[PDB]
């Protein structure tokens, strides 16, 4: 295991299992299936693949070129998500929509999406966004807004860096004999505030029950003692002075007007020092509060 570290070795091992994300994915898959039936007048089946928590560069490197990349806003979460519409999926959708029964072999040679193809992408994207919002509403209500569309992964730059860890969710859609894929790409920073909710779903009766749980939690942790350490003074010395140091030595010190009270190093308050009852005491002037 003794190997020289080198840059660009993004050995980012962040392993989790977002059961709530999985359930939202399944609900959105059902909503998208019914929406696709409504639009295409044909019944698809959507298989939700494994969630890939992978670096953004690795996710993008596997994306076929060209492809539809739709930027979306997950309000109020800071940042933007992406919807990946594959050329095969868009081809099949347009073929079904515009008279083609889809029996013809799918010929994807690689080309940009025309304005008509763009509008078809817009419609299926609107349906997908509505279904995804509906799926998420069961856990956390949010607003999803379309931003714009792109053909290249370089057009998007969804993360600050390509090595940023991102979540991808694939869906394989089958209609008759025609197969396609579409993906949902959300930066891990999007879900980091809600990581606790996404890991475990095991709550269904929680609207005021959450408030009751939090109130019990706070009122019960309010009975836990702490370790107040008040650093009276601070002298900088050298190790030679430490080694030669002997009892009776007087160490000069700047006069501490304010004593900082901290726990485990964590500053708690600013106070003045004094003596009462024969013991050292602190009269608090200001608690440490940003």
């Amino acid at each position: 295991d003794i190997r020289p570290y080198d840059p660009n070795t993004q050995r980012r091992v962040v392993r989790e299992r977002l059961q709530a994300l999985e359930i939202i994915n399944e609900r959105f898959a059902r909503q998208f299936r019914m929406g696709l039936f409504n639009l295409l007048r044909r019944s698809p089946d959507i298989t939700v693949g494994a969630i890939r928590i992978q670096p953004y560069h690795e996710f993008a490197r596997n994306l076929p070129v060209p492809t539809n990349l739709n930027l979306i806003h997950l309000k109020p979460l800071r940042g933007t998500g992406l919807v990946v519409f594959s050329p095969s999926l868009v081809f099949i959708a347009v073929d079904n929509l515009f008279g083609g029964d889809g029996r013809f072999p799918t010929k994807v040679e690689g080309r940009e999406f025309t304005h008509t193809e763009q509008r078809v992408i817009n419609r299926m994207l609107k349906l997908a966004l509505e279904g995804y919002s509906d799926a998420w509403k069961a856990i956390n209500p949010l607003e999803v807004e379309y931003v714009r569309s792109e053909m290249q992964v370089k057009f998007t730059n969804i993360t600050t860096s390509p090595n940023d860890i991102v979540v991808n969710t694939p869906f394989h859609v089958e209609i008759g004999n025609l197969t396609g894929e579409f993906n949902i790409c959300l930066p891990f920073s999007m879900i980091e505030p809600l990581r606790e909710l996404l890991v475990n779903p095991p709550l269904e009766n929680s609207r005021h029950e959450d408030q009751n749980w939090r109130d019990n939690l706070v009122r019960q942790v309010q009975h836990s003692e702490l370790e107040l350490v008040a650093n009276f003074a601070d002298i900088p010395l050298r190790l030679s002075q430490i080694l030669k140091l002997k009892p009776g030595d007087v160490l000069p010190i700047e006069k501490p007007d304010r004593i900082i009270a901290h726990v485990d190093g964590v500053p708690v308050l600013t106070s003045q020092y004094g003596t009462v009852n024969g013991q050292y005491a602190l009269r608090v002037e200001h608690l440490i509060n940003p």
């Binding site: 309010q222 009975h223 002298i235 050298r238 430490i242 007087v250 009269r283």
Partner: protein
Amino acid sequence: DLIMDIPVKLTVELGRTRMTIKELLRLTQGSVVALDGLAGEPLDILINGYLIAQGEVVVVADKYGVRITDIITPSERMRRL
């Protein structure tokens, strides 16, 4: 050998107390909290969180300083452990 200089940070602690979150959040302006250290008891001296000595506040020509009452011992470290 080469470690003779090694800038070190020495701190002295005024006192410690056992107190909980309720009163902790109920501290107000001008409120006084006592510490386990008796007045006149030499304060402790710590380096990176560990015992190094016990020192007492002495008036040295209008300049308060800390005079080392004693250097720690492994025995006393075990006892205070």
